[PDB]
Amino acid sequence: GFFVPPTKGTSPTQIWCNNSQLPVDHILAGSFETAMRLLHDQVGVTQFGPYKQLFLQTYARGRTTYQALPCLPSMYGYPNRNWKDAGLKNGVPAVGLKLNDLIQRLQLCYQLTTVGKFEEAVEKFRSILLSVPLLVVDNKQEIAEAQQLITICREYIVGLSMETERKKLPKETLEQQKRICEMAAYFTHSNLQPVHMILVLRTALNLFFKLKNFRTAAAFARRLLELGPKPEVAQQTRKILSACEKNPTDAYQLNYDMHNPFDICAASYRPIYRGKPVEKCPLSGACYSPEFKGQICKVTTVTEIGKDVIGLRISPLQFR
Amino acid sequence: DELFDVKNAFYIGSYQQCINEAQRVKPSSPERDVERDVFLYRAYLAQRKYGVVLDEIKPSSAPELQAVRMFAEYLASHSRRDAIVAELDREMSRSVDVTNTTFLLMAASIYFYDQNPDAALRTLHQGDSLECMAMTVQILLKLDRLDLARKELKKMQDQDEDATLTQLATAWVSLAAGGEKLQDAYYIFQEMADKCSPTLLLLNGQAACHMAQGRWEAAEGVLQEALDKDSGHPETLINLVVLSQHLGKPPEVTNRYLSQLKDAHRSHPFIKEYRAKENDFDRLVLQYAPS
Numbered sequence A: 001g002f003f004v005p006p007t008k009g010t011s012p013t014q015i016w017c018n019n020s021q022l023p024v025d026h027i028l029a030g031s032f033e034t035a036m037r038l039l040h041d042q043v044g045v046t047q048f049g050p051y052k053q054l055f056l057q058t059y060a061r062g063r064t065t066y067q068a069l070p071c072l073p074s075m076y077g078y079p080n081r082n083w084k085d086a087g088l089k090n091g092v093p094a095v096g097l098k099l100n101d102l103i104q105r106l107q108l109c110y111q112l113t114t115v116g117k118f119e120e121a122v123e124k125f126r127s128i129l130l131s132v133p134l135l136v137v138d139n140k141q142e143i144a145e146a147q148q149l150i151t152i153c154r155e156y157i158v159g160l161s162m163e164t165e166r167k168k169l170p171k172e173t174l175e176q177q178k179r180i181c182e183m184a185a186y187f188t189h190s191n192l193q194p195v196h197m198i199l200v201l202r203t204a205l206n207l208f209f210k211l212k213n214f215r216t217a218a219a220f221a222r223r224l225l226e227l228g229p230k231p232e233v234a235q236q237t238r239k240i241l242s243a244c245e246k247n248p249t250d251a252y253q254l255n256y257d258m259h260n261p262f263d264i265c266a267a268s269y270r271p272i273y274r275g276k277p278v279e280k281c282p283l284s285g286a287c288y289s290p291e292f293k294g295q296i297c298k299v300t301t302v303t304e305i306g307k308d309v310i311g312l313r314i315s316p317l318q319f320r
Numbered sequence B: 001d002e003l004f005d006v007k008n009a010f011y012i013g014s015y016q017q018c019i020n021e022a023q024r025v026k027p028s029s030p031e032r033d034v035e036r037d038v039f040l041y042r043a044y045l046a047q048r049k050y051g052v053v054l055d056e057i058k059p060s061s062a063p064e065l066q067a068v069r070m071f072a073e074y075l076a077s078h079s080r081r082d083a084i085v086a087e088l089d090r091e092m093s094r095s096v097d098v099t100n101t102t103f104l105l106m107a108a109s110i111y112f113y114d115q116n117p118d119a120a121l122r123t124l125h126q127g128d129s130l131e132c133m134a135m136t137v138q139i140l141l142k143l144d145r146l147d148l149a150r151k152e153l154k155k156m157q158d159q160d161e162d163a164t165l166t167q168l169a170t171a172w173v174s175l176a177a178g179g180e181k182l183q184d185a186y187y188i189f190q191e192m193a194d195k196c197s198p199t200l201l202l203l204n205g206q207a208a209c210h211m212a213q214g215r216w217e218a219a220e221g222v223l224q225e226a227l228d229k230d231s232g233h234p235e236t237l238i239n240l241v242v243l244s245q246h247l248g249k250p251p252e253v254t255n256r257y258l259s260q261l262k263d264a265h266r267s268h269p270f271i272k273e274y275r276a277k278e279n280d281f282d283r284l285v286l287q288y289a290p291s
Helices: A012-019 A023-028 A032-042 A049-059 A099-114 A118-134 A140-166 A174-187 A194-210 A214-226 A231-246 B004-011 B015-024 B030-046 B050-056 B063-076 B081-093 B101-113 B117-124 B130-142 B146-159 B164-177 B181-195 B200-212 B216-229 B234-246 B251-264 B269-288
Strands: A064-066 A075-077
Touching: A012 A023, A023 A032, A023 A049, A023 A118, A032 A049, A032 B269, A049 A118, A049 B251, A049 B269, A064 B200, A064 B234, A075 B130, A075 B164, A075 B200, A099 A118, A099 A140, A099 A194, A118 A140, A140 A174, A140 A194, A174 A194, A194 A214, A194 A231, A214 A231, B004 B015, B004 B030, B004 B164, B015 B030, B030 B050, B030 B063, B050 B063, B063 B081, B063 B101, B081 B101, B101 B117, B101 B130, B117 B130, B130 B146, B130 B164, B146 B164, B164 B181, B164 B200, B181 B200, B200 B216, B200 B234, B216 B234, B234 B251, B251 B269
Parallel strands: none
Antiparallel strands: A064 A075
């Protein structure tokens, strides 16, 4: 016999796929269809268009390269994160994106918000949100931070998106104005950080003051002061608040309850109280009124609103 | 061996050095003179100077040179490829020479590119040189059969434990083995660069070994040095892309390296693959997308 053509062994990238349930690991292996399926089932990704750059970019860092014999096609290397104990069967791809990287980029988002560039802020924010399911976290608390990081992103995305619309609506009708005040007050309930929470409270205060809805304005004034704004703002706020006390009454009844638990409709920008029916993005936690079930989330831009899912998977720990 | 330097310079990747020495060498045997010309043109081929080989190697040239020229046209003319493989198939079956190792190496090379590992391997199986063994090792590795590769290695390990060809082969196998073997590979690449010279080939070998283990910062330097010698060197740019992302560089950086690659080699296999990935992604978007 002597010469027998040898049969292919299993490729390193295939090994990675057979070894992980983590999306990024499959993207790193070039297994897009497999990666997309994982993202579709764990979280509810359905519109993968805005995930193109993440995939290609992630994929481009998957394998190193080096030459063997001159003139022949070069060799590819497949660095493993567990290179020490990875046999020729237990390898899993090196990690090229970490939680800290995402948390760090959050600051540019915070900056952009403060200086009023809401549109760019939403991009950076969305960019981080979509990147969380591409992590490979180590411990259980690191998994909580990832979930909390996603939460921050949607909170600001629907909050800022709502605001940019309110600024677009017309301000002629009394109705048109009651609508603006309402939206402005809804922002008041977003969980941003103090420096921003203050900026939106400051805004709502003015709107409600002009709408001669002084009783509700006084409450906004008190919540703002407790946040400890800069001196000038605090002073202005005390001034408006004493004005409001001369006539502690709201002219018009608005569709807003400051004491009844909300959930902003990320599409219509209207309140969905305590136990009312709501449809939520399986990934961002974004909320929508039942009408929108089955539609592509406006916050995530790639997710399906009604979709039932396994849940975010970014750590082997999550597979007991 | 009077052509020891010439060949060695070739294998470690410093082609100009190979070409320079090839010319300083004096025949001293119609055999050696042919062996020399063979490496001279193998070197021009490595530098992608196809025209030089196609024009200078004429019909009356030795059969060893003809083999080289065969690979040269396959490499140069994309259209002439199937016609070449066809003739190669015929020559390979309708005849039985094996003493001509250069022919086997060139023929096996064409088969390698034609993505026909079985034929390349079947051809090499007939050869008997140390290079035939190194090429067999390379192919076995690309076939992901480290086991078959280890066997061939020892085969050449028993024959010449210190030949740079055996040392390079061992490094490839080590890189494939992973784990501890990674440092072995690093040292042979480093020693080689130290003794001979730091060729783009050897520099990237070192970088691959460092990155295998998670030493991204230590790979920085070798990649910088390689890039400084040739912007547009495929392996360097690719490794830079990978390295940039691990060092946390601005995403534009990774992208710049990618674009730089397209500039230097419009049709490199890595560029083609990238394009292919873009394609099935668009295709897959359509598959999941709402109607």
